[PDB]
């Protein structure tokens, strides 16, 4: 099975690039990260920062999680991120994604030992 921390890295970490290079980036990454096999993941966010810089968010501003949970943290600074949202004309198994590049604060839920991000709550 996949540990909740390795899963957050596979679905959200992309430190190799500084930001979405083309409008096909989401179609590319959603595919190389295995997020379109049993269905098209309708929404996913990639962060273009170092894994360390994203794990350090677990020691920043503590805020409520979108589900009420109290183990979410908001990054003090804005981070480079890419938003992948399934387009209306997307069809399993041929997923189509709109890619939107942006700089925003990310909010992730942290868990376990050591305290690492285990779920991407949102960005603002």
């Amino acid at each position: 099975k996949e540990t909740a921390a390795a899963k957050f890295e596979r679905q959200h970490m992309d430190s190799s690039t500084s930001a979405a290079s083309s409008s096909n980036y989401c179609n590319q990454m959603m595919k190389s990260r295995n997020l379109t096999k049993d269905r098209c993941k309708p929404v996913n966010t990639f962060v273009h920062e170092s894994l360390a810089d994203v794990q350090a968010v677990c020691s920043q501003k503590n805020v409520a999680c979108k589900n009420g949970q109290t183990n979410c943290y908001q990054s003090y600074s804005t981070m480079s991120i890419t938003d992948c949202r399934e387009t209306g004309s997307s069809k399993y198994a041929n997923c189509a994604y709109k890619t939107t590049q942006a700089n925003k604060h990310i909010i992730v839920a942290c868990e376990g030992n050591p305290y690492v991000p285990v779920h991407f709550d949102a960005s603002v």
Side-chain angles (χ1 to χ4, degrees):
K1 186 154 96 203
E2 181 164 37
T3 72
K7 192 205 213 139
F8 169 94
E9 293 167 333
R10 169 168 70 75
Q11 311 183 86
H12 305 297
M13 291 302 301
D14 190 355
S15 319
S16 72
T17 179
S18 42
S21 41
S22 86
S23 56
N24 264 119
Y25 171 99
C26 280
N27 275 127
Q28 242 129 103
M29 294 285 303
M30 292 299 283
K31 177 117 267 188
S32 12
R33 287 318 179 71
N34 229 61
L35 306 166
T36 52
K37 278 58 202 167
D38 311 310
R39 33 65 251 246
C40 298
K41 207 170 164 243
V43 178
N44 191 63
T45 300
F46 284 99
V47 183
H48 306 289
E49 303 285 350
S50 60
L51 176 59
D53 269 18
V54 173
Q55 304 185 315
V57 174
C58 288
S59 77
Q60 300 197 359
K61 190 69 173 180
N62 181 241
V63 290
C65 290
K66 196 128 47 59
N67 69 7
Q69 268 177 343
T70 209
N71 75 112
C72 272
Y73 295 81
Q74 189 180 109
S75 48
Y76 289 143
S77 165
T78 48
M79 287 189 161
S80 192
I81 66 104
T82 293
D83 186 271
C84 296
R85 164 114 354 170
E86 190 181 38
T87 69
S89 43
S90 183
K91 181 79 126 74
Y92 156 39
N94 246 160
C95 311
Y97 285 103
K98 178 184 176 46
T99 120
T100 310
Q101 234 290 139
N103 261 265
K104 304 154 61 176
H105 294 98
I106 66 152
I107 297 151
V108 302
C110 305
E111 250 189 58
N113 198 41
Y115 220 43
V116 296
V118 110
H119 149 85
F120 194 93
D121 202 68
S123 67
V124 53

